[PDB]
Design a protein around this nucleic acid. Structure first.
Lengths: 122, 54, 214, 118, 113
RNA sequence: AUGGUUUGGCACCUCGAUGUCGGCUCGUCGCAUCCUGGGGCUGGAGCAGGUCCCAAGGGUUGGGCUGUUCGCCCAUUAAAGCGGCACGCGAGCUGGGUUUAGAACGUCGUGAGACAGUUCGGUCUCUAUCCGCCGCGCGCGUCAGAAGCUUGAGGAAACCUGUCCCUAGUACGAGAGGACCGGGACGGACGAACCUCUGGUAUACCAGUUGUCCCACCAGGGGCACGGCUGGAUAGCCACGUUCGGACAGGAUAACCGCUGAAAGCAUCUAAGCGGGAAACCUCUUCCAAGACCAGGCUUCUCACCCUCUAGGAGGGAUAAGGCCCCCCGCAGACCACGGGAUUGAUAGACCAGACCUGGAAGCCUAGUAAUAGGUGCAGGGAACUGGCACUAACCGGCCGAAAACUUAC
């Protein structure tokens, strides 16, 4: 249940720590973004000499949320913190290592390299 | 706000005739050998000796 | 050509599928209705059928109604509604007296129900019609939840009927469509509809095979 | 018991609860009280429940009564007479009787009694 | 008698253990991956249980790679071939939502005795 | 030549008051159409297009700067339309600007002071009489009085679209690249209904807890302190949540494509005729509706008394069917209405049991120096949900409410 002007953490190697949501892609007047919906997002923090730089405009995906999400089985999920992953136009990550867990939704959105790089999918 | 005209006799008396009154539906009671008329709401309380009958 | 039946809403619950999905099923107790009367193009000018459901202890019914039931020969019931059919096709399968039972449907059958909605009383715009109200701060002098404007200025100088306003919403007949059906119980005379049907638990529904899908 | 569906009886839950307790006090003290109607309508259940605690007599029931009404003479009265006196009558200890309205505000009035028939 | 009881008792799932919040637990979940149906394990601390009879559900918190993860479940689902308590818990509360604000050795629980 | 929105021209109503820029909320209308839909021509290979015709049903984003309209930019989008209604709307809101008194800078003036120059600050009054509009009642009417079921004139609501997959890496083309038509799956915004799940609220639920006063004191509890605060919280109400919806087809059509064919030896979509044809139109979909005065229809029950005015036609009584009031109530509700029950009774409240929420009571016993912990014990407490029980109340009853006839056809 994410929006504009929302700060998120990164789960990558890219050399960023934080990001900011600018849009939510998948239509027009889309208000919310869940676990598996692309965003377009800039950078508000960096590592010392990361590849990424503070002020970029990159494109990302959400893998975690703090708001709950149903599934077909009647189950739910709730992570603690809102996290995201930089991704390039072929829906591939920029990084090489993923931090922390993700959701099973990404296997069915066709975000699968991520799931291969995930340590713990839930 | 404030009216604009002197609202007529017809309309005036017409609406005024809605501010009326109805009468309660009365019922007898055999109050100790004699009879008096009382609403039905209070019938038991009269037969038990609480209603101030004047 | 249009199978319908009367029933009573009970509540809601969950059940599961073979793929282990979960379905929010509403229950209905279509107790076995009775056909009181009939409607034809010779008598009345249209094609229909008239149904009955419930129980009255025999002194609560009125004498006109008792005549309407004893003339057709059968006993009195609470609620009496009327499906409207197409012709002799949908009439040739009905007989006065006969007991309908819920088995006339099958799992997967798409239905449309009708029911009397729940009441909400004298409702404002922000509950009837979903208006953005107005701001709660920045200088507002007492307009935090009331609509705004209502028209022009000396043209028209009127208010354009159907202008939306406060008043009693709720308590209206409502139609809910294309609901699948998950299970039928013949032992207890029950349907397990999917979805979410109108009304308050303990009222009256009327379920029908759907137009778009039947 | 079943809470008031709307706004309360004298201006707040505080004043409501205090008022009900004073009126139960007066009731068990005398046997009849004359009061406006919704107070009686609100005071049947409260009082019947206190009476039920009295019937099922115990230290614990007694304290859980004393934490409302604040009057030891009246609790002694309950647990001494009104408790056993309504042993076999299972439910329904009170009676309401409507009477002549009130001059000042036409308001209803009602006399709430304890029954005495067993 | 829970009006839909005659609808639900013929659909319940028997033999579900009497557990309770605080009771640490491991859950064997059915899951579908690559159109194969296999099983996964999920360990954690039951922080609640919300009765409704057949709509009843429970919640399991876990620490994953520094990230807290609640996973909810309905009790009677066929997506559960096992629920196995590992420990018990001395907790005064019923709903243990005070574990969200806590990390580390502070979000530990006692055991019965 | 239009249109009358723009800067202006005239000064015709309003100066014994027509409240002025923009923003918000709320619309509704036009098409000179941004997208969607149909189509003719191409310097149209195909994908994309360019221009022109018909077409208004629906939709027509969030953000940075500026008081700003306009505009520029960022990121998306199927698309980011143009305008009117006192440059829509201040008895609906703002009051940043502009346009009162304060003050300052530049320039003019000797000076008071001024600037379609600037800069910081600066009271927005009103109980809705009438029309209008959204909803809801009383009365009378529809040739006897009443109760149920309903037809449908005529009106309203809804109408949006995208991305991938087979079609096919085929058509096409040097290749790059790359389809029409037609079938599917999954989603965005919107709208309704509902509360099983999730989540929120919870002023008579439970537990913990601080200060303090009282219950003679310890214990155990209460009152006040925004419910004192904190953790949680069934029902009801709700949305972030659930499910569903936007049909399919059909008739007459616009632009358009035509067939047969003259006047006019050929020719021509037409002058006589016959066709196909769009999100627009009429039906279909959901709602209302016989106060639709052409006041409808199919049905059922009652379907029968009395006294007066001098029998003139009326009047006045007591009635049946039935309704109303009083009464118990509702998840129906501004009041009224609506819905149900009314001892031939489970409507409400209580009581017993259950479900669920809280979370292991008081008392006693034990261990402890004491804080306190353990046992008895899913304990106790407790509100709406459910089943049972007639114990209390729904009463030993008042009021309204039924037939001029007349003619043809029979």
């Amino acid at each position: 249940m994410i929006q504009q002007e929302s700060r998120l953490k990164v789960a990558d190697n890219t050399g960023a720590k934080e990001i900011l949501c600018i849009r939510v892609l998948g239509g027009s007047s889309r208000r919310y973004a869940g676990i598996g919906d692309v965003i377009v997002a800039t950078v508000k923090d960096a590592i010392p000499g990361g590849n990424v730089k503070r002020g970029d405009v990159v494109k990302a995906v959400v893998v975690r949320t703090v708001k709950e999400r149903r599934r077909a089985d009647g189950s739910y999920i709730k992570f603690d913190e809102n996290a995201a992953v930089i991704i390039k136009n072929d829906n591939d990550p920029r990084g090489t290592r993923i931090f922390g867990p993700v959701g099973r939704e990404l296997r069915e959105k066709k975000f699968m390299k991520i799931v291969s790089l995930a340590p713990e999918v839930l | 706000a404030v009216p604009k005209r002197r609202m007529s006799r017809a309309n005036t008396r017409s609406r005024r005739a809605q501010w009326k009154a109805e009468a309660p539906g009365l019922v007898t009671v055999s109050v100790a050998g004699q009879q008096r008329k009382v609403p039905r709401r209070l019938l038991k309380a009269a037969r038990l000796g609480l209603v101030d009958l004047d | 050509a249009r199978k319908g039946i009367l029933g009573t809403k009970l509540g809601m619950t969950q059940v599961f599928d073979e793929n282990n999905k979960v379905v929010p099923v509403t229950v209905v107790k279509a107790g076995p209705n009775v056909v009181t009367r009939i409607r034809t193009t010779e008598r009345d000018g249209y094609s229909a059928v008239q149904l009955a459901y419930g129980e009255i202890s025999p002194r609560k019914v009125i004498k006109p109604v008792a005549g309407q039931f004893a003339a057709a020969g059968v006993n009195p019931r609470r609620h009496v509604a009327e499906l409207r059919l197409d012709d002799e096709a949908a009439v040739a399968e009905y007989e006065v007296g006969q007991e309908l039972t819920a088995e006339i449907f099958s799992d997967g059958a798409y239905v449309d129900v009708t029911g009397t909605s729940k009441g909400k009383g004298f409702a404002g715009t922000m509950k009837r019609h979903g208006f953005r109200g107005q701001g709660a701060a920045h200088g507002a002098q007492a307009v935090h939840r009331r609509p705004g404007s209502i028209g022009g200025c000396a043209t028209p100088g009127r208010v354009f009927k159907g202008t939306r306003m406060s008043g009693r919403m709720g308590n209206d007949r409502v139609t809910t469509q294309n609901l699948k059906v998950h299970k039928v119980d013949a032992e207890n005379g029950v349907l397990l509809i999917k979805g979410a049907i109108p009304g308050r638990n303990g009222g009256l529904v009327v379920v029908r095979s759907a137009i778009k899908r039947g | 018991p079943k809470p008031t569906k709307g706004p309360r009886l004298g201006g707040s839950s505080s004043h409501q609860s205090a008022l009900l307790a004073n009126l139960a006090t007066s009731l068990f003290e005398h046997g009849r009280i004359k009061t406006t109607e919704p107070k009686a309508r609100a005071l049947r259940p409260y009082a019947e429940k206190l009476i039920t605690h009295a019937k099922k007599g115990a230290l614990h029931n007694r304290r859980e009564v004393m934490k409302k009404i604040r009057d030891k003479d009246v609790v002694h009265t309950l647990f001494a007479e009104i408790g056993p006196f309504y042993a076999d009558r299972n439910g329904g200890y009170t009676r309401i009787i409507k009477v002549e309205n009130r001059k000042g505000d036409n308001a209803p009035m009602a006399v709430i009694e304890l029954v005495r028939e067993k | 008698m829970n009006t839909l009881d005659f609808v639900d008792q013929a659909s319940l799932r028997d033999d579900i253990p009497t557990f309770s919040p605080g009771d640490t637990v491991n859950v064997h979940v059915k899951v579908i991956e690559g159109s194969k149906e296999r099983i996964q394990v999920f360990k954690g601390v039951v922080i609640r249980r919300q009765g409704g009879g057949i709509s009843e559900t429970f919640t399991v918190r876990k620490e994953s790679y520094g990230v807290g993860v609640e996973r909810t479940f309905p009790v009677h689902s066929p997506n559960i071939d096992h629920i196995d308590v590992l420990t018990r818990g001395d907790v005064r509360r019923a709903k243990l939502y005070y574990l969200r604000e806590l990390r580390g050795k502070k979000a530990k629980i006692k055991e019965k005795r």
